[PDB]
């Protein structure tokens, strides 16, 4: 299960960081070179099968990585992300045991590489399924191995955010930015080539007179993106970083050293719910996958308990859908907190054995009363930490200030935790 | 101040790019007429007439120009002095700036040859 495949599969690893340990700004050089790569990495492929739909998971899929039928971004970092996540699951969930010898953590990275590359091969096969099938596979792995090396040289290396999360962040900066200035439009009732950009709402002032009805189209634009939408989008970002700083402080006398107080915190977002939101997302993705098997044996009657009601009118024509959608959102994130914490760490015994394992004892009482010191925080700071994210994403939908909604709130929450992770190693 | 230099280099590709073609604005890239089968593939930079551009042509030209100049700025501002990390950071700086310089001039040479059909 681990003892056999891991010793043989060691082919072409990465080089661990040198003895040039402390530095300020060549750290940022190792960031910026990867950002040159993902200038470059989002660039055109070499095969002329020009298929009609770009990608099938292009929108949600696009939200994760946006080079759909596009560049060497390979439709996602979804290999490294999914392969990292279920690896940390099956390490934390004891379906598979824990390796804490350095040989086991090194081969743990090796198996990480293994499942990552196998999943790249899976995505390659599943997108290509003509006679021109050669060398696509060679390109993809070469560009899978590159994203692998760039991510693992930005965890043990520079790495502060991650390799991963800052790639997602910068590519999301770009996906706003193509909407910010937009040069082309292939040629409505009036007004070509201006769709919810600020350049659009700066070219709009150059074309049309009667600037009152230039303001009105700028601030209450419905079918295209809106700038009131962008104000609400910014507003949500500000509030969510207001709520990331919600943290519980716990000071700790370290064992065997006089009075150093590196206080362990518990933030409410509580791994920022990259389980728990994607818990909320992917069950409602797997049925809208499997409604395709409902066409034979639907987008109508099954939708009334499936989706948000999509309407800015708060009193839109069905309160049943609104109530059940919001209650399902809140209950789903809360319930998947109170079930999630037991597997990917940071439950009561998890925290206790990590702190004993790193020699940190609460001052108030005995070492294995620390459990009862903090067991009256972690479930609620799971559950509330579940709950007032989803209701928060209610405020991401109830008001359309979100470029993409819930998911954008929460992937930038990924970035915000990501900054802490990168900063950690300074 | 040096912010005035920032203002000027900001203005540089801005009026190298498309202030001339603000009022004479020509939309980004599509001009193929089926070529034998496939109808409206967007072509390129304009090639046959020399003075014209599109929005997509001009921005690319401007971007090529200011990165080369600010690469020379980086050669001046850090590579000639000797103060920071004398084996790791410096070598990166000369490395990526020489890459900037060589590949930039090479590609702009290409982007005058192929729209221009000049004997190289």
């Amino acid at each position: 299960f681990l003892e056999v495949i891991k010793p043989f599969c060691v082919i072409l690893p990465e080089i661990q960081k040198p003895e040039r340990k402390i530095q300020f700004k060549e750290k940022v050089l190792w960031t910026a070179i990867t950002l040159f790569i993902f200038l470059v990495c989002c660039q055109i492929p070499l095969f002329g099968i020009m298929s009609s739909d770009s990608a099938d998971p292009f929108y949600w899929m696009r939200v994760i990585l946006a080079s759909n039928r596009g560049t060497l971004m390979e439709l996602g970092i979804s290999p490294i992300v999914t392969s990292g996540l279920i690896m940390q699951l099956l390490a934390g969930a004891k379906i598979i045991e824990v390796g804490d010898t350095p040989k086991d953590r090194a081969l743990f990275n090796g198996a990480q590489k293994l499942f990552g590359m196998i999943i790249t091969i899976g995505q390659s096969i599943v997108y290509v399924m003509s006679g021109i099938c050669l060398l696509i596979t060679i390109q993809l792995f070469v560009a899978g191995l590159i994203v692998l090396l760039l991510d693992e040289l930005l965890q043990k290396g520079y790495g502060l955010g991650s390799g991963i999360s800052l790639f997602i962040a910068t590519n999301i900066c770009e996906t706003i930015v193509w909407k910010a200035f937009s040069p082309t439009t292939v040629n409505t009732g009036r007004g070509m080539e201006f769709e919810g950009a600020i350049i659009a709402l700066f070219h709009l002032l150059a074309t049309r007179t009667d600037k009152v009805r230039a303001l009105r189209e700028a601030f209450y634009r419905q079918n295209l993106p809106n700038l009131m939408n962008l104000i609400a989008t910014i507003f949500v970002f500000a509030v969510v970083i207001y709520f990331q700083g919600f943290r519980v402080d716990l000071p700790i006398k370290s064992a065997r050293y006089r009075g150093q107080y590196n206080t362990y915190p518990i933030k409410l977002f509580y791994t920022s719910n990259i389980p728990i939101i994607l818990q909320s997302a992917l069950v409602s993705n797997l049925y809208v996958i499997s409604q395709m098997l409902s066409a034979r044996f639907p987008v109508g009657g099954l939708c009334h308990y499936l989706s948000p009601p999509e309407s800015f009118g708060s009193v839109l024509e069905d309160p049943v859908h609104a109530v059940v959608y919001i209650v399902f959102m809140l209950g789903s994130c809360a319930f998947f907190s109170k079930t999630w914490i037991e597997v990917s760490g940071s439950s009561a015994k998890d925290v206790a054995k990590q702190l004993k394992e790193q020699q940190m004892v609460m001052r108030g009482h005995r070492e294995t009363s620390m459990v009862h010191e903090l067991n009256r925080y972690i479930p609620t700071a799971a559950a509330f930490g579940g709950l007032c994210i989803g209701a928060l994403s209610v405020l991401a939908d109830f008001l359309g200030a979100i470029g993409s909604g819930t998911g954008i709130l929460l992937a930038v929450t990924i970035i915000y935790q990501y900054f802490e992770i990168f900063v950690k190693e300074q | 101040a040096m912010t005035v230099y920032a203002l000027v280099v900001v203005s540089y590709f801005l009026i190298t790019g498309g202030i001339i073609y603000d009022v004479i604005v020509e939309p980004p890239s599509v001009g193929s007429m089926t070529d034998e089968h496939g109808h409206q593939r967007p072509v390129a930079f304009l090639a046959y007439r020399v003075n014209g551009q599109y929005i997509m042509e001009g921005l690319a030209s401007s971007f090529l120009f200011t990165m080369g100049g600010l690469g020379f700025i980086i050669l001046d501002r850090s590579n000639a002095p000797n103060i920071p990390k004398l084996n790791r950071f410096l070598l990166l700086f000369i490395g990526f700036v020489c890459v900037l310089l060589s590949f930039f001039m090479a590609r702009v040479f290409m982007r005058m040859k192929l729209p221009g059909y000049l004997m190289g």
């Binding site: 080089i15 070499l46 390109q139 590159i146 040289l153 | 890459v99």
Partner: peptide, 29 residues
Amino acid sequence: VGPVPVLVMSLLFIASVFMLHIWGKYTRS
């Protein structure tokens, strides 16, 4: 990255893509 070749390696890969992209397109038009 004790060494910088991994980066150089990435550059080589892009060149292989860069050059090999137009290399087959040489015989076409």
